[PDB]
Amino acid sequence: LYFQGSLELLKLRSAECIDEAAERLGALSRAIWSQPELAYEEHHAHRVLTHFFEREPPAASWAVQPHYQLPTAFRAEWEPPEARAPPRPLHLGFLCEYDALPGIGHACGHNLIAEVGAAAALGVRGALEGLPRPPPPVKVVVLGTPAEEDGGGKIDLIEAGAFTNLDVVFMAHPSQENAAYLPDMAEHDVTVKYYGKAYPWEGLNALDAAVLAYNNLSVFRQQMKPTWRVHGIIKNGGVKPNIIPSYSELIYYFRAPSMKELQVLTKKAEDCFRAAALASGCTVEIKGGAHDFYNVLPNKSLWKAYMENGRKLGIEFIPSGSTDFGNVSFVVPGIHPYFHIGSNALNHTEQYTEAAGSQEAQFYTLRTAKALAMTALDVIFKPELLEGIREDFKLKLQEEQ
Amino acid sequence: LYFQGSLELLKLRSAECIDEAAERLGALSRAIWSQPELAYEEHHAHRVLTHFFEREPPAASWAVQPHYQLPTAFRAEWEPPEARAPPRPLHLGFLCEYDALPGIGHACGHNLIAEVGAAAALGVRGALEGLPRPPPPVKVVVLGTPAEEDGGGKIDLIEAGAFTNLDVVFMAHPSQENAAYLPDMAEHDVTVKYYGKAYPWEGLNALDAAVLAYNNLSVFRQQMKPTWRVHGIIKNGGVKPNIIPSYSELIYYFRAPSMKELQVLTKKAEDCFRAAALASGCTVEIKGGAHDFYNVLPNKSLWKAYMENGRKLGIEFIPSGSTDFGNVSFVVPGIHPYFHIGSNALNHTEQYTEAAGSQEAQFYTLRTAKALAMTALDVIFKPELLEGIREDFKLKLQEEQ
Amino acid sequence: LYFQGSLELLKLRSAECIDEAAERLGALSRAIWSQPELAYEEHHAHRVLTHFFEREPPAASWAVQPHYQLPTAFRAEWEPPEARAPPRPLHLGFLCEYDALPGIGHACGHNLIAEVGAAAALGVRGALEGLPRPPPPVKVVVLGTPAEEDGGGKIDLIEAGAFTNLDVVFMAHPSQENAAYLPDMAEHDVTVKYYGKAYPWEGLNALDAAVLAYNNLSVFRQQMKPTWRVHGIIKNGGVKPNIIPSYSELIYYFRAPSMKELQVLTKKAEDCFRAAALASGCTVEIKGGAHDFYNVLPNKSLWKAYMENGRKLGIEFIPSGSTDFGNVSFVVPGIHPYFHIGSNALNHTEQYTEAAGSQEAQFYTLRTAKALAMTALDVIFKPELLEGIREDFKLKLQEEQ
Amino acid sequence: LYFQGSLELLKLRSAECIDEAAERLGALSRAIWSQPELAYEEHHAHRVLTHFFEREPPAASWAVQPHYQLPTAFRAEWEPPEARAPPRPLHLGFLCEYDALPGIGHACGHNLIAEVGAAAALGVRGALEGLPRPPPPVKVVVLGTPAEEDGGGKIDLIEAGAFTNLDVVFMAHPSQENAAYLPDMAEHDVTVKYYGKAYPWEGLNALDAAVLAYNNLSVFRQQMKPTWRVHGIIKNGGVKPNIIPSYSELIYYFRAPSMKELQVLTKKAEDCFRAAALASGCTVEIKGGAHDFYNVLPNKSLWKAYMENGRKLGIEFIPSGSTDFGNVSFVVPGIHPYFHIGSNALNHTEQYTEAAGSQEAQFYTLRTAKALAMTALDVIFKPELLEGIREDFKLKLQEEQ
Ligand SMILES: [Zn+2]
Ligand SMILES: [Zn+2]
Ligand SMILES: [Zn+2]
Ligand SMILES: [Zn+2]
Ligand SMILES: [Zn+2]
Ligand SMILES: [Zn+2]
Ligand SMILES: [Zn+2]
Ligand SMILES: [Zn+2]
């Protein structure tokens, strides 16, 4: 309330600090949206974002590390520059995504994800910078995570230990409605290659193998759990009709709400692929993807605290697929709310690219960044909340084996 | 020629003896045709045929053994009753078939097969009975072989040793044209049963197994040798749609021109059946038929001698499927000529039953019986022919491993 | 409260009247459970239930009509016998089901459905019988509806106009948990018959038609809405392998949450069935079931009033498939709550038959009957509720076209 | 015999003229074999062959027309230069093929086909050049026909009228054995394209269409005539698994021994392709090849005359697929004998390329060219043969509708 240094007053400061930075935050979104770049090729977005945190006044007050582990990834850190000597500081992480989609551009609104992560972290710092009483030990960490749509850049960062010292991690994703949580499933990719032998009696038909595998999985759909998903293509199904195909290649991905269910679904698919080899006489290589994507672990305490802030900002509550943030949420407590940006268009369509770059989307983006920053302030000043986040994180970890 | 006791004169005697017996031979065909009986159920035909050889004058001059090994099989033997004491007699076999088809009756003309086997043997005896100079040691053996269309009664007789002491075996089969030999293939029967487990996620779908097996074999047809044949049905594909089928059953038969090719074809089918089990998660029982049918081994010497007789009778030369005579032809040299009976109807159709019982078919049946009997006389009096039959039989046996 | 003739006091009377009748209501359930009868064959259950309402004291105070429209259906009615002359009486319906399942008996607990419908109606009458002040014009109607698991006896009753004068209809169904509503989908049954022509070149393969139809639907599953369901069997897939099958027969049922979605799903299946005919060369008969089952329309006012009563009885809130009550709920406002009976066994399994007939299930059955009866009392004495039920019923009817 | 100007003496002259030209004919084969060129790209072979006939002494005695209708086709003509004025001259055609195979080179021995056509025509001219008595009116015509393995260059030449004035046409093809005729079937090519629409419920799956078409044809194989052939590939079966494929493409070719059978086979395939569209909901384009290849019409008189010559040369008598010579044989009487070249390797394999260019193949090639040339001499001097060829050609034309 009207009290010296209230949490409600710090929350107001962070919202004022975000409104003051609206112009240059909009420029940041425009720079990434206008130059769409694909996974691991986000060189321009990496330059724009590293320069953004280097130029925040005072110069070099954000400690920026470009090319952090990945060439297009980065890391920016800020803390109050004073020590006292008590005693573990709180580490709060904010993620920026910035990879686009082939052909249609930023049809997932990833330019706004970079903006919202930068804005939230800016707002937190400004609320803590305007504090007389020595501020609690906090480090604001920003991580640029490339290649969300393909590869999974967060996973490469996890393998470098980038998340081992974070206590909470925040990010947000533009969608069609406002929701503090939405079920993103685990995912496993696979590439299947069949090899036979090229009169047609003396023939092993690798095209038959591909078709029989397709038939095997198709009838299996009747026994799939209703939450499971299986999609795939025949990449190579022959070259010339006068030669019996001695090579075929399929590309599939499977999805399930948990890792244990995903392993069961993957094993039944493996049987379907191996059966086609047995029936055709071909040999088969089944090569899984480099990284499995994890389902997103929810955190009741963090989500309930986030919704209470958004309701004050005026957000009314009620996705794209699977994200490498699920791997993050398995090692650091986090939230990944989806927000609406003034459009009815669907994600990963051409009309969403229009909305993602529109002037009208800027209001909704900064508003949700305000909600993230206030939620970070809650964790900083409510120790009962921090233990609540850690309790919910520990319990959900056991239920996922 | 016009020489005392010429082979040409004995051949004429056998034709006269067959013409004299035309009336009662026609009655024999009529008795079997008018009362069609199925495999192993030919009780009436067994009575008619045993009574036929018992009534041939003088009474009991044919040594008849009813219920020989099988209830509806029989054996009849005749030899010149005088001994001399020299020295191995020649054993000449003639087979009678007499089983019909379900519903359509004697649509394969099996009544005429019984007639032609009885007639040939009658003609041989009459040619040798009217001989003054002590006749060469010969035993005429007639074997009633039931269950040709299903089961294979000749094979049951082979297992009892019925063919171990025969030197040559004769029979003939009514068809659409006249041919001393026609390619009957080997055959292997199989019954495939799938077992699963009965919400549908917790389900093993045995109907999927049947359909996937069908798909597996269907695409395999492109790589089958053009002489191979595969036919099958889904006998049991479920009972009620609201229960996931936990049981399915297929019935298939495979055909190939040789036993070595048939084993290769059977092994690829086995892979197709097992792949469906792997893809569906079901277990599978693959039960082969009680008896595999063999392809018919030709005998150049016997066939060339048969065609030379038929040409004298006026027969001009150029099938149903697979016959257990192929198993016989692997242990005794034999011939299985097909003959035309005055009709364009196809075997195993309703209109062939009409032809098989017609008066017009009697002329062609007795004519081909005349050709068989003269061919038997050739073997009896041409030792160079007998060794030629045995040489060709020995060589063909090696080529079939 | 402690007021002369309170609704809370009438609700207590109905619970006392149900407890007093527990012994003979248990006997009623035992009589149906011990003699399981199938659809349209429930002659013994029809006798037991008609005799039950005829014996309720005073004799013939329930007006019983046996063999109502169907041979095993019945109708029982009671009202206060006094007229006043004001003015439309309220008609309250209670349904009794009593058909079992082949082999496993009453694995859906339908004996308890008959009991709960009889008990609810008994409790309502006893609450209104013990009233001095002239009671509001009410008619309690009980309808025996045979053949729920097959055929749909309620639909036959709808076609006779049995529901045209009911204002509200009640029934309850034993399951695994307590829920005032659970989503039962619409359903459409179909029987598909393929006709071809019986050498195999001159052949139309009706078995191919069945298998191709199966393949057509199987790959379609990937594009089915996740709430849709398709299940089917190959009833007839051939008779003998040596005859090319000229006839095949499939039996399928489809489910969708609305009639509009069900028509779309049925049309795509029709394309899959017709494509198999085109590909094989066969003709096809597609024969839909005699009666389509409708999805169950919820009624917010009735369900919220029912849950408020159950909470007082001690019921804690949170199915089998599709029911012909959905057709009823489209013409009369109704509720179809599911209740737990002391077991973890699943419906339509052998172990549920054990629970359905157990002594332990009697407490839960009478308890839910108490909840239904009190809910009926709410409708009788709260005119604001009756209009609320009619408003919600009218609006839901428009959303379903 | 030893008679002035005997046909046997002219036949000897043609064999001597071919032996004298062995060195430069071998060089011709070597020039084409060492520089393999594909269909319609045979620029170097066109230069070599046109220069060959231009250099035959006396210069320009062969009237050479380069770039005849096609850029790599050619035409060379020779006749005795003297007129007499009687009266229609005999036109005798010899074809040269010279296109190779992708990757493996001249694995069909087409370099030897060019050689044998040049050699036969050289031998005919030399036999007629060494004649005093005015020679009968004959024109020797050589036609370079490119693109046999793809496209069908003879068909392009037929459409230009190149064959309308030929009386007999000769060519020969290296294989594994010596045969005056071998059954080459008719062929029809087709390209099938499926178009759908890209959540997956709102999806038309063009990949399903391709797979269902494959299933439709696969089960049809059981009812195909045993002489029919169907082969095909899935050229395009998707691009990325996360997008439902809205486009697929198949490439198939069908073969049958006659055009009437080929139309029936093509119509059943058309049904299979259209059924997949109906089942999937996609639209379909079925585009047949630019040119259908015809089966080769035999000519008993020409073949019997050819075998009588080859037997004198020492050839003992007893393929690759389908050839555009079948279209030629439908408008001009011709023969297309296959000859052995000293190898057991199969056509269109890497080891056949070795044999085709070997020194050992030259003897067999020149020998068969001798047989062709003597057969041409038979037609020139036996008018009874010419009418016999024309009678057999006319009758076979009616049997093919
Ligand atoms: Zn995305
Ligand atoms: Zn995204
Ligand atoms: Zn038969
Ligand atoms: Zn037969
Ligand atoms: Zn039920
Ligand atoms: Zn039920
Ligand atoms: Zn070739
Ligand atoms: Zn070629």
Summarize the SSE layout with pairings:
The structure is a homotetramer of 401-residue chains.
Chain A: H1 7-20, H2 22-33, H3 43-55, E1 63-66, E2 74-78, E3 90-96, H4 110-129, E4 138-144, H5 153-159, E5 168-170, E6 173-175, E7 186-195, H6 206-220, E8 229-236, E9 247-256, H7 259-280, E10 283-288, H8 300-313, H9 325-329, E11 334-335, E12 338-340, H10 350-356, H11 361-381, H12 383-399
Parallel strand pairs in A: 3-4, 3-5, 5-11, 6-12
Antiparallel strand pairs in A: 1-2, 2-4, 7-9, 7-10, 8-9
Bound molecules: zinc ion (8 copies).
The site of one zinc ion has 5 residues of chain D, from loops.
Annotated CATH architecture of the largest domain in chain A: 3-Layer(aba) Sandwich
Main β-sheet, spatial strand arrangement of chain A: 1-2-4-3-5-11
What's the CATH C level of the largest domain in chain A? Alpha Beta
Given the C-alpha coordinates, what overall shape of chain A results? elongated
PDB class: hydrolase
Keywords: PM20D2, Carnosine, Proofreading, Cytosolic, Metabolite, hydrolase
Assembly: tetrameric
Entry title: Crystal structure of human cytosolic beta-alanyl lysine dipeptidase (PM20D2) Tyr314Phe mutant
Description:
4 copies of one chain form a homotetramer. Chain A is α/β, with parallel strands linked by helices and 401 residues long. Chain A has 2 domains: 282 residues, Aminopeptidase, CATH 3.40.630.10; 103 residues, Alpha-Beta Plaits, CATH 3.30.70.360. Chain A is 42% helix and 17% strand. Chain A is built from 12 helices and 12 strands. In chain A, the strands form 3 sheets. A 6-stranded mixed sheet of chain A has the order 1-2-4-3-5-11, with helices on one face. Chain A has a 4-stranded antiparallel sheet with strand order 8-9-7-10, with helices on one face. In chain A, strands 6-12 form a two-stranded parallel sheet. In chain A, strand 1 and strand 2 form a beta hairpin. In chain A, helix 1 crosses helix 4, helix 2 packs antiparallel against helix 4 and helix 8 packs across helix 11. The radius of gyration of chain A is 24 Å and the shape is elongated. The two termini of chain A are 44 Å apart. The complex binds zinc ion (8 copies). One zinc ion binds next to loops of chain D. It is classed as hydrolase. Keywords: PM20D2, Carnosine, Proofreading, Cytosolic, Metabolite, hydrolase. The assembly is tetrameric. The entry is titled "Crystal structure of human cytosolic beta-alanyl lysine dipeptidase (PM20D2) Tyr314Phe mutant". Chains A, B, C, D are Xaa-Arg dipeptidase.
